[PDB]
Design a protein around this ligand. Structure first.
Ligand SMILES: CC(C)(C)OC(=O)NCc1c[nH]c2nc(N)[nH]c(=O)c12
Ligand SMILES: CC(C)(C)OC(=O)NCc1c[nH]c2nc(N)[nH]c(=O)c12
Ligand SMILES: [Zn+2]
Ligand SMILES: [Zn+2]
Lengths: 347, 347
């Protein structure tokens, strides 16, 4: 396998389905990435993460640099080895969880250079440029100043990554579009990132309300290079994913249980004697073996197994959603799927 | 399979190894029973419990009657179905976790009759008689009065169980010896229980210090019927198990990680960069896949996966201990095993 190759197999309107091939594995797109906050996907063994269908997970640079530490993880062999996940890992840059033109110092430093270095020490497969994330709402002046700094930092990120031969040869680098909700700033940002050149392009700064997010995506995603993956950071509700895919997004990150009829809160007393599985159609191991009543009990009792079973179901639901999206786009029936999904999820 | 059959395959001194056959499965003795406090073995799926070698688990009548409730579990199909463990389950009576000759009332009633009924509603395979547990230390007068009440309650337990045909036909009933540390009271209690007749006999009221416990076991276990299982309640340190087996016990219940060189506390900073598994010889899935350094990180970070991995290792260590005990007794080399175990565990 190559360092990085994105192939589009099928399209429907702005929606795409395809594959990212990398040295550690293939990523089916559109993709949902479980989040491994402190070198673990909460309450799941990596083998269980994989069994839900996940092709890639996300690691948080901010949290790992604080505990257990990036240099420590490198000395122990890198994040993949440390946590026992051997497939691709995307790391964020830290711009959300964390000031001057050099970078930021904080109490528990980060800069374009140090962020890229940390992601190298972790052994990330997909590295994110270090950005300045613009609060919402933002005045046009502030959004502009902030986007411009982020594009300067994107070039510094690019140069840092490229200066590290092992990283340049084995990992990919994504740039992050900024500009708040303003079309001209999003265009300027897209142009700047494309001039620098990246392996993929994230839409940052969103996640305001859904209508507003979708309006910004309507004009922002077509600005990005068509032939590279489009990653919407920080957006994970099922409905938000469906509409973002309809607007050209390829990648997403991560008592409430998801069902095809909408979310339920399993702690509600109505579930105390309900022998049905969490969802009627879900193929996951939890829905095969345990009732709503049992999981209700476990979560109300504070038992770790309740967290384990709820998280495995929810991740498996997300991966089933992504599979249904991929198949419907490849079959040219994604519009119909989106309509059917919503009429039931919100019935 | 029969309702209940205990067979002794091999002996060495007072130690025995054999099998209890029951309708839901075979129990290899000497046996260690993981504890399922609120209808779950902490942080483990039942399939993971089984993969460690466990043949039987323990459920706590006190806790289940409070949450989710015994009548509720029966309406949902019984404890086996509710939690997804299809092998034997032993339930305690509640005499430890919880006054008059009728029973006890408390704030979050129990009596011999209601305890047996609760265990029936849960669908327990091995039911414990309801006892009065004697505090330690106890004066001879108090220990005697208390033991006598427990023997009256043992007869009421026997009569309650037998009056329930489905329970009598499908479950087993164990009696509990009392008498504190006094040889004459332990003898009186053994005699009373044998006159009533049970499928197995527990030594209650112990777990004071190890020397004292072992002295009491020296004279108390030979008093119990030889041809039935001997269960020491509430005693679970590895050293305590080895010496209790040497005195004729067959059954036991459940940051610290067990190793063959002694326990370690994985939170200690000395483990922060230790790439070795928890134990050098352990065959468990955790020791095959993850380092001390990773588990150190997880436990210090409060992550659920740390609890999951520590518990699976510890239970697997206990089951490996029990297997080594069983094999050594069957091979007539248990004395040597006990000596070798201690010289290393305490090196
Ligand atoms: C809170 C607001 C709406 C201002 O930003 C976002 O929602 N931002 C989304 C986001 C999530 N993770 C990110 N990592 C980086 N590097 N940059 C980002 O913009 C983001
Ligand atoms: C605290 C002292 C030493 C007084 O008792 C014990 O250690 N007792 C051990 C024990 C554990 N679980 C039990 N369940 C019941 N029904 N009866 C018991 O005696 C016990
Ligand atoms: Zn499910
Ligand atoms: Zn182990």
């Amino acid at each position: 396998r190559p360092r990085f190759s994105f192939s589009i197999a099928a399209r429907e309107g702005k929606a795409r389905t395809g594959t990212i091939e990398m040295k550690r594995g293939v990523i089916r797109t559109p993709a949902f990435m479980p989040v491994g906050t402190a070198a673990t996907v909460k309450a799941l063994k990596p083998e269980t993460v994989r069994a839900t269908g996940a092709d890639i997970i996300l690691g948080n640079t901010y949290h790992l640099m604080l505990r257990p530490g990036a240099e420590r993880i490198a000395k122990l062999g890198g994040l993949h080895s440390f946590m026992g996940w051997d497939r691709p890992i995307l790391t964020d840059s830290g711009g959300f969880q964390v000031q001057s033109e050099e970078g930021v110092t904080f109490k528990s430093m980060l800069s374009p250079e140090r962020s890229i270095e940390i992601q190298h020490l972790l052994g990330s497969d997909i590295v994110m440029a270090f950005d300045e994330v613009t609060p919402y709402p933002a005045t046009p002046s502030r959004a502009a100043s902030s986007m411009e700094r982020s594009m300067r930092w994107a070039k510094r990120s690019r140069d840092a990554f490229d200066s590290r031969k092992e990283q340049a040869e084995n990992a990919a680098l994504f740039g992050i579009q900024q500009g708040s909700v303003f079309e001209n700033l999003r265009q300027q940002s897209a142009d700047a990132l494309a001039e620098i050149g990246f392996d993929g392009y994230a839409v940052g700064g969103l996640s305001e309300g859904q209508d507003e997010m979708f309006r910004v995506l309507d004009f922002s995603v077509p600005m990005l290079p068509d032939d590279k993956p489009h990653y919407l950071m920080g957006v994970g509700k099922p409905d938000d994913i469906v509409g973002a895919v309809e607007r050209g997004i390829d990648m997403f990150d991560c008592g409430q249980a998801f069902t095809w009829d909408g979310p339920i809160n399993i702690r509600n007393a109505r579930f105390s004697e309900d022998l049905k599985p969490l969802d009627s159609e879900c193929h996951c191991a939890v829905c095969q073996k345990w009732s709503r009543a049992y999981i209700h009990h476990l979560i109300r009792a504070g038992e770790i197994l309740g967290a384990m079973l709820m998280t495995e179901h929810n991740i498996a639901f997300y991966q089933q959603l992504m599979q249904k999206i991929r198949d419907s786009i490849s079959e040219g029936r994604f519009s119909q799927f989106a309509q059917d999904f919503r009429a039931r999820y919100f019935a």
